[PDB]
Amino acid sequence: MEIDELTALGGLLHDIGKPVQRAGLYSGDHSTQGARFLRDLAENTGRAEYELLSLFSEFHNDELMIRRIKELSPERFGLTMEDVLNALWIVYEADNLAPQASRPLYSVFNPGKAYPWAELDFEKELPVPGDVFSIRSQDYRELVKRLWEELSKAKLRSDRLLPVLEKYLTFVSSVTSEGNIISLYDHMRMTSAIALAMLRAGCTAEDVRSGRCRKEKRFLLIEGDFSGIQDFIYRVSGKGTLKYLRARSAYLELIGWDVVLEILSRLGLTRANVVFNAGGHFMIIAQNTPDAVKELEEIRAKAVEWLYREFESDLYLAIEWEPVSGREFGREGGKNLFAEARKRLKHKLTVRKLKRFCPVCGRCPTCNRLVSLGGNLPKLLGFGRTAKNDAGVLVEGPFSGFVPYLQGGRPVGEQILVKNTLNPGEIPESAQFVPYFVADYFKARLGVLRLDVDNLGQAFTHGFGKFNTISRTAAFSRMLSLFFRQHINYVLARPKLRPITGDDPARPREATIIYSGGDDVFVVGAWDDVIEFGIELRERFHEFTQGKLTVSAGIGMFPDKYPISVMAREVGDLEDAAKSLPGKNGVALFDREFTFGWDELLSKVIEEKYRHIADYFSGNEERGMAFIYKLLEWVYFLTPFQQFANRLHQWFQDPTDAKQLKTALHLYIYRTRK
Ligand SMILES: Nc1ncnc2c1ncn2[C@@H]1O[C@H](COP(=O)(O)OP(=O)(O)OP(=O)(O)O)[C@@H](O)[C@H]1O
Ligand SMILES: Nc1ncnc2c1ncn2[C@@H]1O[C@H](COP(=O)(O)OP(=O)(O)OP(=O)(O)O)[C@@H](O)[C@H]1O
Ligand SMILES: [Mg+2]
Ligand SMILES: [Mg+2]
Ligand SMILES: [Mg+2]
8 A cells, every 4th residue: 555545544444333332333432433444444355455554543652663564564665654545644734724412413503503423425415404413322323334334345545435435424424523514525525626736745754743733835726716607607609508508607616627527637646636616616735845836837827728729718717825824724713824824825826817818619629529418418427537638538628639428439538527426336337436516407588597695705714714725715615616516406406496387296496597606506497487496595505504695696588599699798797786785685676677585576576566466367357468567557546355456555655565576477478468
């Protein structure tokens, strides 16, 4: 076993004893039960490398440590006694830099509610924060049962170990204090990320005991961010199908993964070093060495060069890095060092962005390939990442060709990106497994929705400063991604809100997501499903975040040959109107700019004014079209049922009741006419 695998896997598995001990498997602390576990794993199956990795749990110089490394005889794995010792000290420091066994993981949005334990990657039914229900020993026993089975089967490799730990430890508290918001998965990968970085920075056991890795700028915080996305995605003509736009959006995800995996490859890191990769905006923990810097400088130049030659200024990737000490991953309490670091890095990226300078495409050959991919997306299981002009390459990024992995075909590549599953399954043993998750929902006018989280920046930096360490930032980012890449699927598949449309058979929405990720959604479909979807999505989000974040939205309606370019800008402007309301939390309903609170649109506009008109004009002779049109144009001169007219009259005073009413009348027209 190689020293870099030793360190990265040791960092992942150093804390494996915690569910073991919470299940009561053996006896002693988690350090003791974790080592016994991995040793049982080694001896039960035959993979001796689980023995050597049991040492990392056994900590977390002493006679006993030395004697123990000697018993293990690391030479049979091709390591020296000194090697294992340096790794054990490195992981020990990585864990430092990154009370009652029944406490669950508390919610990031309210440290008063908490998740019951659940396994990921199965009917992902919005595990949201309920009241404090301590976790049973027997829950952990079922956890350890699945853990053992999947650990038994998985390659002893970061790309295969990571997804097993994510599957089962995402809703396990890392430290059972109350109010703890860091999952055990988040802590393990952060430990692994920082330990591998320390190894690549050359940190030794001497640097660790001296405290030099806490003090000195041994790490880089790398941050990348695309700009120009709206022009890259939505600048297409009338020709340009919905399929074509979905491929366009999926292509940009590939372009960002190409850069990320090139950085990990070139610097010698693991997917664990990816703090997050959300909306074409990523953060990576790396070593601060001269070599790594000049790798980064070359990757950046290449990616920027490729982007400009492929699409000129239509799409720009800004990459920056910030040297930081291990101490700057954390707060030091009244220091807020990590927050300071993030804001220097944000300022550089800001600066880097100022330096940025076909019938469908504008500029087509890449447009031909996106149509092809557009056709294939219902059966696409993922993408093989390979040499640019290898066989099967459909589209290219700055560094690689991507081969579509289809339901029939055979996966091909050195990295295989696999869609919406943590199970590597089909792929070859040699391949680097890279799971990615996307909201891939797919069913007189059509409806277009843009929803976007209000003030997302401020929450990461201050918000509700509970996220001012690297691990809490990873925990916050991940929860958010869980909403926008998975939970939004369920809302489209199993909706419950149909005030406009009828309940009748519970039916999926007539809609397709063009993109959902980071903190933004772009959705099209039948115009009333799209309205009901925006509201129901906002309410799920409101319950998911316990009201600590809000969202604003735009819903436009459009004829059929309408250019997508104009559609996107027009709804963005409606979203602008909703953002520019004080307090943001709102929605511009239709291509005008009267704007409503979320709870007032549903309860007042929809379920008070609108169905007042709808109930009392149902299948009625004298067409409500006649009545509403002239009413859209004194009160008893204008003269319905006395009780019908009078409720209308009291609404037409001067309040906000008048303007909601007009939107409600507008709704009747669009629903009923023709
Ligand atoms: N693959 C994708 N498809 C569609 N939209 C995406 C994709 N990736 C990111 N986005 C969205 O695009 C938006 C960003 O748009 P754009 O790049 O035009 O401006 P910006 O990123 O705010 O500018 P800057 O990067 O300078 O801050 C984000 O809301 C993000 O959610
Ligand atoms: N899951 C996530 N993890 C980490 N960062 C994210 C995530 N989702 C979005 N972001 C980032 O948060 C920021 C959102 O910026 P945006 O331009 O939408 O403003 P914001 O802070 O919410 O202000 P506003 O309320 O106007 O949207 C961007 O930096 C985006 O890349
Ligand atoms: Mg921009
Ligand atoms: Mg936002
Ligand atoms: Mg946004």
